[PDB]
Design an enzyme around this catalytic site. Structure first.
Site, PDB file in Angstrom:
ATOM      1  N   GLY A 125       0.808  -1.205   0.000  1.00  0.00           N
ATOM      2  CA  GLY A 125       0.000   0.000   0.000  1.00  0.00           C
ATOM      3  C   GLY A 125       0.841   1.254   0.000  1.00  0.00           C
ATOM      4  O   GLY A 125       2.071   1.217  -0.068  1.00  0.00           O
ATOM      5  N   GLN A 126       0.162   2.397   0.081  1.00  0.00           N
ATOM      6  CA  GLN A 126       0.881   3.667   0.103  1.00  0.00           C
ATOM      7  C   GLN A 126       1.709   3.825   1.380  1.00  0.00           C
ATOM      8  O   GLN A 126       2.891   4.189   1.327  1.00  0.00           O
ATOM      9  CB  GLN A 126      -0.101   4.822  -0.044  1.00  0.00           C
ATOM     10  CG  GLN A 126       0.576   6.184  -0.045  1.00  0.00           C
ATOM     11  CD  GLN A 126      -0.369   7.301  -0.394  1.00  0.00           C
ATOM     12  OE1 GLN A 126      -1.102   7.220  -1.374  1.00  0.00           O
ATOM     13  NE2 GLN A 126      -0.367   8.350   0.410  1.00  0.00           N
ATOM     14  N   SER A 131      -0.672   0.132   6.125  1.00  0.00           N
ATOM     15  CA  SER A 131      -1.633   0.893   6.914  1.00  0.00           C
ATOM     16  C   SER A 131      -2.777  -0.021   7.334  1.00  0.00           C
ATOM     17  O   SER A 131      -3.076  -1.006   6.658  1.00  0.00           O
ATOM     18  CB  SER A 131      -2.178   2.104   6.138  1.00  0.00           C
ATOM     19  OG  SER A 131      -2.867   1.765   4.933  1.00  0.00           O
ATOM     20  N   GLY A 139      -5.853   1.909   4.621  1.00  0.00           N
ATOM     21  CA  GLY A 139      -6.008   1.754   3.185  1.00  0.00           C
ATOM     22  C   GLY A 139      -6.781   0.500   2.824  1.00  0.00           C
ATOM     23  O   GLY A 139      -6.937  -0.426   3.626  1.00  0.00           O
ATOM     24  N   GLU A 186      13.173 -14.182  18.354  1.00  0.00           N
ATOM     25  CA  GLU A 186      13.485 -13.576  19.631  1.00  0.00           C
ATOM     26  C   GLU A 186      12.500 -12.461  19.968  1.00  0.00           C
ATOM     27  O   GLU A 186      12.263 -12.190  21.155  1.00  0.00           O
ATOM     28  CB  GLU A 186      14.927 -13.079  19.613  1.00  0.00           C
ATOM     29  CG  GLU A 186      15.503 -12.810  20.994  1.00  0.00           C
ATOM     30  CD  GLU A 186      17.012 -12.876  21.014  1.00  0.00           C
ATOM     31  OE1 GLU A 186      17.584 -13.712  20.272  1.00  0.00           O
ATOM     32  OE2 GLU A 186      17.618 -12.097  21.782  1.00  0.00           O
TER      33      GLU A 186
HETATM   34  N1  GTP Z   1       2.512   7.512   8.664  1.00  0.00           N
HETATM   35  C1  GTP Z   1       2.102   7.452   7.412  1.00  0.00           C
HETATM   36  N2  GTP Z   1       0.788   7.176   7.164  1.00  0.00           N
HETATM   37  C2  GTP Z   1       0.337   7.107   5.890  1.00  0.00           C
HETATM   38  C3  GTP Z   1       1.198   7.306   4.827  1.00  0.00           C
HETATM   39  N3  GTP Z   1       0.480   7.188   3.682  1.00  0.00           N
HETATM   40  C4  GTP Z   1      -0.808   6.918   4.001  1.00  0.00           C
HETATM   41  N4  GTP Z   1      -0.915   6.879   5.373  1.00  0.00           N
HETATM   42  C5  GTP Z   1      -2.110   6.597   6.195  1.00  0.00           C
HETATM   43  O1  GTP Z   1      -2.709   5.392   5.749  1.00  0.00           O
HETATM   44  C6  GTP Z   1      -4.109   5.509   5.762  1.00  0.00           C
HETATM   45  C7  GTP Z   1      -4.520   5.397   4.284  1.00  0.00           C
HETATM   46  O2  GTP Z   1      -4.124   4.162   3.700  1.00  0.00           O
HETATM   47  P1  GTP Z   1      -3.133   4.058   2.435  1.00  0.00           P
HETATM   48  O3  GTP Z   1      -1.796   3.450   2.745  1.00  0.00           O
HETATM   49  O4  GTP Z   1      -2.950   5.411   1.817  1.00  0.00           O
HETATM   50  O5  GTP Z   1      -3.980   3.042   1.500  1.00  0.00           O
HETATM   51  P2  GTP Z   1      -3.420   2.076   0.345  1.00  0.00           P
HETATM   52  O6  GTP Z   1      -2.747   0.837   0.873  1.00  0.00           O
HETATM   53  O7  GTP Z   1      -2.573   2.780  -0.691  1.00  0.00           O
HETATM   54  O8  GTP Z   1      -4.807   1.518  -0.232  1.00  0.00           O
HETATM   55  P3  GTP Z   1      -5.757   2.199  -1.354  1.00  0.00           P
HETATM   56  O9  GTP Z   1      -7.094   2.336  -0.634  1.00  0.00           O
HETATM   57  O10 GTP Z   1      -5.845   1.233  -2.508  1.00  0.00           O
HETATM   58  O11 GTP Z   1      -5.120   3.469  -1.915  1.00  0.00           O
HETATM   59  C8  GTP Z   1      -4.385   6.838   6.449  1.00  0.00           C
HETATM   60  O12 GTP Z   1      -4.368   6.713   7.869  1.00  0.00           O
HETATM   61  C9  GTP Z   1      -3.177   7.668   6.123  1.00  0.00           C
HETATM   62  O13 GTP Z   1      -3.032   8.621   7.152  1.00  0.00           O
HETATM   63  C10 GTP Z   1       2.541   7.581   5.078  1.00  0.00           C
HETATM   64  O14 GTP Z   1       3.328   7.762   4.134  1.00  0.00           O
HETATM   65  N5  GTP Z   1       2.981   7.647   6.385  1.00  0.00           N
HETATM   66 MG    MG Z   2      -1.965   4.075  -3.030  1.00  0.00          MG
END
Ligand code: GTP
Ligand code: MG
Ligand code: ACP
Ligand code: 93X
Ligand code: GDP
Ligand code: CA
Ligand code: CA
Ligand code: MG
Ligand code: MG
EC number: 3.6.5.-
Lengths: 439, 424, 62, 317
Positions: free
Chosen positions: A10-11, A140, A143, A254
């Site tokens: 994911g992102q 996350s 996401g 561990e």
């Molecule tokens: N700490 C941190 N949180 C992130 C980041 N990117 C997204 N988030 C958090 O992750 C959640 C959103 O999920 P994403 O990771 O963006 O979703 P995804 O896996 O890309 O899934 P999709 O729904 O397909 O885009 C929210 O709480 C965001 O605040 C990051 O780079 N750092």
């Molecule tokens: Mg994404």
């Protein structure tokens, strides 16, 4: 020497991946082009850093990572970024369209069609391992990919590697830096499905980090860069033991052994200090005893909760830098008195400590100031059940009206997986109570 | 690339669609000849959402222009950016539709729809990852209302896993062509409840009032009303045409805005109301935007509650002061938000303001006060249908009184559904 | 306050400090669920195309 | 303008703190379950502390201290004085914790004359242990009020703000059994409104069984040649300080994501040698009738508006 495979989903998992792997390179002295001058065994080795890096004949050091995202936009920036020459093109895996913040669309619908390819790409890493330990999975809770595809991947990984350890770094969802109203839904859902497949999960609440960036780095609107560069330091402290010479926490087994007595209760609370702004002109370097006291302030935890009101099951102290044990047991001795630290009766009141004499590395130009000593505490306390309570209430408000449920059912889920997943979280909340409070 | 296919149908649909392309083409640097003469690449980063590339590396709107008479289309072609449009993408017939839903949906419309879907199909197949479709149309006439909803049914059939989004103008006595407008609009609303994911309710009553007792225009033309629609349509699509922390797309918007599949009719809002060199301060954007006087749909939102809200501020302003000001008016007016959808108000900022404004704010609200709109149409509808008045225009095209009773019935359910969540 | 397994080495030290003492699902089962969801999707779509087909024969009757 | 919710509806005193709050034209009340509040007036039992302090842009304050039941549940109050080193301590009656810990064994090491008391009164162990709840020694020689030869207890109200300033309400109340005192027969042995509003002539030697402070000082002067400050209130301020300074590190909200204040009701006994004793601490006290206005206002002044400012009557400890 035994290898570790990192998996960024994911992102959030990919962008934090970038934050960690940049730091790993700065720490082991690996250049953006994969070369490592200090590495004299060209093309191989069973050093500690080889647990995370493999080596090519031409001398390049190559992450044992795989990056997965259902859309290309974010992994594409790795594909062209400062470390394009670092990864094998086959290690960066992107789909067509993302999971539209929908657990059921990342798990069932879109998930089912990339899962066989990703496992095949992971397999090509497992095959480069003389004795693979297991996996570090970054994602996350919120996401659709991060929650839904990850729990599909954690399912098959128990099947294709039943004897391998699986660790989680999980980004828990915070409103004041968030992206979807249904993040509580995807949170409960993926936690229910992933539980029995993860041996140890480190939860980072985005509100904690955001406030830490506000208060300690004096940044009004912390970016994901700010958030992720600090998350790196904590992940680097936690993983340091796997990539460096040491005798504490030297394999993924561990982490289970030292922090996880009860297997369902496998969410150790992390605390970290010191966080110090690099634009802080004059700064008075803090002492061993000072940064160990910080480990007991809520305002430095990766999840805001009050550990005075639960019981500890384990505590680990990981120092980076100018620290000696004398300094440490002194500071412990004094804190034992003045603070509420209560272990469970069937557990020893004590600390496992580790010191890596290399002080923490900072991204040049970034926002964190370099320090001479830092610590990361990992305490399996029952006060982290506050974060489940919070999530479970937010889920209860929406699900009582079935709000947004139709978007899940639309993908093939049944309302029952909702009440099954919430009944599991209600048990997990109860287990925590059986362990942390008295009549 | 997540491309959008835009379709504009009928008189009202093609004039507001034509203004939409005028506005956002200027925002994207594209001149009336399709050439790009802009200064930032933020203009070109997500430009394939609404534009296809050309051979001379020009840019052509992914836009299909549909009418059952040519009167409006040659006027679009002769207007400002008229020659920007793909000339094959003008699909039209000659007989007209007579402000008659049946003629658009069943007789004259059915004769023309297949040729429309051939352009859809041609435009759709070029798309790398088409998100779905955006239709602009009125609901009170015949082409945009009747043929428009027929197109929507067919597109849903051919592309059932793409997103269908509409901009749908609501008839009002205050700005009215004919008396059968409530008939046509009750019939379309039945189609829209079933076959769209997101519909923006642009009310012609609201646009008139705003134009009268605010923009201080005593007799407002349709160009005054459509100026306001230009601005809302630009703002409601900002997060789609421009990069940001938010990866906004049609499907994510519906997932987060619509708790219940039928309750997907959004009240848009805008500030400042243009028709000025002191930019508004962030507390002015916030107070105005949420004022009854800045809604494009003509419901006082203090009469029902917000299920969800999504807002964007355009300009260079204090990101933090936005958050400060948003959370203020929420916790000064928490009586009009639902307590059972945590974090249901979402905000974004975009550094690119639109032409001639240093500070602006667009608002998308899924409020249950939109039941005031459907009640209003339902009252006008029953007032005639109880005496079967004007029905002959429809029974002469094949329709039975039955089909009306059902559309009346399904829309009064819609009003009931919206009412049961106002109290929870 | 006791201290056990002190471990020195070139990179650092590690040790323990005591203050008081004490008193999986198969692939086929996966494939099942993952395909009982795709069927539920396909059923829902077939109901959609059936209701649409009925609209066509109403458009044809008008 | 600020935001508060109400979640203990039948709270004697916070009902009036919630009403004074509306009346200032600066505090809007919400539904119980609306999470966008500045101030909770929470549940007696199971107040959800884990959900406080997680609303962006919201400063949240609550009228309870997580962990304050260490002092109020008489079971854990005894365990606290026995276990906590700051409480060696010779103002708490001899007490033992027993179950249908526990300490039945050493409960009798001191039994060579002994009469005691228990609820949650007898001289022989059997009569009460059949209740299969704490066990205290009984104040056999209390102070007596004349004419009447009356027992009484002292309710001091104590407020602790978010900063842990300890505020003793200037006004206290004596609650006397307005009937002579005897020896055995159980009416004037329990002296309040729980063996006097039904069983026990209900307001003989004074008013409402409630002798307020000004009168009692006067009695002590003429009757004993001393004052309420010297003979009694010093020991009360010592006991209040000792208990709250003891648990302060367990419950302080100084560096927490929400903040607590709480009002307490301490109950004391005086013996014939003018020595003051702690009976028990009340986490949710009700005020004496005529004092509500002055105290319920003093709460809002130093506990509520202290945090949320708008457009003394306590003794700091
Ligand atoms: N700490 C941190 N949180 C992130 C980041 N990117 C997204 N988030 C958090 O992750 C959640 C959103 O999920 P994403 O990771 O963006 O979703 P995804 O896996 O890309 O899934 P999709 O729904 O397909 O885009 C929210 O709480 C965001 O605040 C990051 O780079 N750092
Ligand atoms: Mg994404
Ligand atoms: N150690 C003691 N010596 C003398 N009298 C005592 C005593 N302990 C209790 N009492 C008597 O019991 C009464 C005090 O009741 P107490 O303060 O214990 O409240 P309670 O047991 O009803 C719990 P709550 O008030 O919270 O409902 C007094 O009238 C007092 O005379
Ligand atoms: C109600 O809760 C939400 C609403 C929209 C979204 C995202 C959601 C994910 O990015 C999406 O799409 N939002 C969105 C879209 C807009 O137009 C395309 C907006 O205004 C122009 C906008 O303003 C904020 C947002 C996320 C949520 O959590
Ligand atoms: N806001 C706005 N409303 C319009 C415009 N043109 C027509 N209308 C309204 O649209 C309805 C008539 O629909 P119209 O487009 O003229 O008929 P059609 O071509 O058969 O679809 C009436 O409610 C008019 O008030 C316009 O340009 N702007
Ligand atoms: Ca090597
Ligand atoms: Ca014809
Ligand atoms: Mg017309
Ligand atoms: Mg009492």
């Amino acid at each position: 020497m035994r290898e570790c495979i990192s998996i960024h989903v994911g992102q959030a998992g990919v962008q934090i991946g970038n934050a960690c792997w940049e730091l790993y390179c700065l720490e082991h002295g690996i250049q953006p082009d994969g070369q490592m001058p200090s590495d004299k065994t060209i093309g191989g080795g069973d050093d500690s850093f080889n647990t995370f890096f493999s080596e090519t004949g031409a001398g390049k050091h190559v992450p044992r990572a795989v990056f997965v995202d259902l859309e290309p936009t974010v992994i594409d920036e790795v594909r062209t970024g400062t470390y394009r020459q670092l990864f094998h093109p086959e290690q960066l895996i992107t789909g067509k369209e993302d999971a539209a913040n929908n657990y059921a669309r990342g798990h069932y619908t879109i998930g089912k069609e990339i899962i066989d390819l990703v496992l095949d790409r992971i397999r090509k890493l497992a095959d480069q391992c003389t004795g693979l330990q297991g996996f570090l999975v970054f994602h996350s809770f919120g996401g659709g990919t991060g929650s839904g595809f990850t729990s599909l991947l954690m399912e098959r990984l128990s099947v294709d590697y039943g004897k391998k350890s699986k660790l989680e770094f999980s980004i828990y969802p915070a409103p004041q830096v968030s992206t979807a109203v249904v993040e509580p839904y995807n949170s409960i859902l993926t936690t229910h499905t992933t539980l029995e497949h993860s041996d140890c999960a480190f939860m980072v609440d985005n509100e904690a980090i955001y406030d830490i960036c506000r208060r300690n780095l004096d940044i009004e609107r912390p970016t994901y860069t700010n958030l992720n560069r600090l998350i790196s330091q904590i992940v680097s402290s936690i993983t340091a033991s796997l990539r460096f010479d040491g005798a504490l926490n030297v394999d993924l087994t561990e982490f289970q052994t030292n922090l996880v007595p009860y297997p369902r209760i496998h969410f150790p609370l992390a605390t970290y200090a010191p966080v110090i702004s690099a634009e802080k002109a004059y700064h008075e370097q803090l002492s061993v005893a000072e940064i160990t006291n910080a480990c007991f302030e809520p305002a430095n935890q990766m999840v805001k909760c009050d550990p005075r009101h639960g019981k500890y099951m384990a505590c680990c102290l990981l120092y980076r830098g100018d620290v000696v044990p004398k300094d440490v047991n002194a500071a412990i001795a004094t804190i034992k008195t003045k603070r509420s630290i209560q272990f469970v009766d069937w557990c020893p009141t004590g600390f496992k400590v580790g010191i890596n004499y290399q002080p923490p590395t900072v991204v040049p130009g970034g926002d964190l100031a370099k320090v001479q000593r830092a610590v990361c505490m990992l305490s399996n306390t029952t006060a982290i059940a506050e974060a489940w309570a919070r999530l479970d209430h937010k889920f209860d408000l929406m699900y009582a009206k079935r709000a947004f449920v139709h978007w899940y059912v639309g993908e093939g889920m049944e309302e029952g997986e909702f009440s099954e997943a919430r009944e599991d979280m209600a048990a997990l909340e109860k287990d925590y109570e059986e362990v942390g409070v008295d009549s | 690339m997540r491309e959008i296919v835009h379709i504009q149908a009928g008189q009202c649909g093609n004039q507001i669609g034509a203004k939409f392309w005028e506005v956002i083409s200027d925002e994207h640097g594209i001149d009336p000849t399709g050439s790009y003469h802009g200064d930032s690449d933020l203009q070109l980063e997500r430009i394939n959402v609404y534009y296809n590339e050309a051979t001379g590396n020009k840019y052509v709107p992914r836009a299909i222009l549909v009418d059952l008479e040519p009167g409006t289309m040659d006027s679009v072609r002769s207007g400002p950016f008229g020659q920007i449009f793909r000339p094959d993408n003008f699909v039209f017939g000659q007989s007209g539709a007579g402000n008659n839903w049946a003629k658009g949906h069943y007789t004259e419309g059915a004769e023309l729809v297949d040729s429309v879907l051939d352009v859809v199909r041609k435009e759709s197949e070029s798309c790398d990852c088409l998100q779905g479709f955006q239709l602009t149309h009125s609901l009170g006439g015949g082409t945009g209302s009747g043929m428009g909803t027929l197109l929507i049914s067919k597109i849903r059939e051919e592309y059932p896993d793409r997103i269908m989004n509409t901009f749908s103008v609501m008839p009002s006595p205050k700005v009215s062509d004919t008396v059968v407008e409530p008939y046509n609009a009750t019939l379309s609303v039945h189609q829209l409840v079933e076959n769209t994911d997101e519909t923006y309710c642009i009310d012609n009553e609201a646009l008139y009032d705003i134009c009268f007792r605010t923009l201080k225009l005593t007799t407002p033309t349709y160009g005054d009303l459509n100026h306001l629609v230009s601005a809302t349509m630009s703002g409601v699509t900002t997060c789609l045409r421009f990069p940001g922390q938010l990866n906004a797309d049609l499907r994510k918007l519906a997932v987060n805005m619509v708790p219940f599949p039928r309750l997907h009719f959004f009240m848009p809002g805008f500030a400042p109301l243009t028709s000025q060199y002191r930019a508004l301060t962030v507390p002015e954007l916030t107070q105005q935007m949420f004022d009854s006087k800045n809604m494009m749909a003509a419901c006082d939102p203090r009469h029902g509650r917000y299920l969800t809200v999504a807002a964007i501020f355009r300009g260079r302003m204090s990101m933090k002061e936005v958050d400060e000001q948003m959370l203020n008016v929420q916790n000064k007016n928490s009586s009009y938000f639902v307590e059972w959808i945590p974090n249901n108000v979402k905000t974004a900022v975009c550094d690119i303001p639109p032409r001639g404004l240093k500070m602006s704010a667009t608002f998308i609200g899924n409020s249950t006060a939109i039941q005031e709109l459907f009640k209003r149409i339902s009252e006008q509808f029953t007032a005639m249908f109880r005496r079967k008045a004007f029905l002959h225009w429809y029974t002469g095209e094949g329709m039975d009184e039955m089909e009306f009773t059902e559309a009346e019935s399904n829309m009064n359910d819609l009003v009931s559904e919206y009412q049961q969540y106002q109290d929870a | 306050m006791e201290v056990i397994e002190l471990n020195k080495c070139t990179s650092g030290q590690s040790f323990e400090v005591i203050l008081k003492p004490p008193s999986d699902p198969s692939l086929e089962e996966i494939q099942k669920k993952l395909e009982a969801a795709e069927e539920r999707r396909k059923y829902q779509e077939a109901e959609l195309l059936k209701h649409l087909a009925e609209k066509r024969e109403h458009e044809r009757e008008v | 303008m600020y935001t508060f919710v109400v979640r203990d509806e039948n709270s004697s005193v916070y009902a009036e703190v919630s009403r004074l709050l509306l009346a200032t034209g600066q505090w809007k009340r919400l539904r119980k379950d609306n999470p966008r509040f500045n101030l909770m007036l929470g549940e007696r039992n199971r107040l959800p502390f884990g959900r406080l302090g997680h609303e962006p842009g919201l400063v949240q304050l609550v009228n309870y201290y997580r962990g304050a039941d260490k002092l109020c549940r008489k079971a854990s109050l005894v365990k606290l004085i026995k276990t906590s080193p700051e409480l060696s301590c010779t103002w708490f009656p001899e007490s033992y914790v027993i179950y249908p810990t526990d300490e039945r064994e050493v409960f009798l090491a001191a039994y060579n004359g002994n009469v005691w008391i228990a609820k949650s009164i007898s001289s022989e162990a059997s009569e009460l242990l059949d209740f299969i709840h704490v066990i205290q020694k009984y104040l056999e020689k209390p102070l007596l009020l004349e004419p009447g030869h009356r027992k009484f207890d002292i309710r001091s109200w104590v407020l602790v703000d978010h900063l842990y300033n300890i505020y003793l309400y200037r006004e206290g109340v004596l609650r006397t059994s307005s009937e002579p005192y005897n020896s055995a027969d159980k009416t004037c042995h329990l002296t309040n409104h729980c063996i006097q509003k039904e069983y026990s002539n209900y307001g003989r030697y004074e008013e409402g069984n409630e002798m307020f402070f000004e009168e009692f000082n006067q009695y002590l002067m003429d009757a004993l040649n001393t004052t309420l400050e010297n003979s009694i209130l010093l020991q009360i301020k010592h006991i209040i300080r000792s208990c709250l300074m003891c648990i302060e590190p367990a419950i302080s909200t100084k560096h927490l994501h929400y903040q607590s204040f709480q009002l307490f009701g301490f109950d004391f006994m005086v013996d014939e040698e003018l020595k003051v004793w702690l009976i028990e601490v009340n986490g949710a006290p009700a005020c004496a009738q005529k004092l509500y206005a002055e105290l319920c206002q003093g709460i809002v002044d130093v506990a509520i508006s202290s945090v949320f400012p708008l457009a003394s009557i306590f003794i700091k400890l």
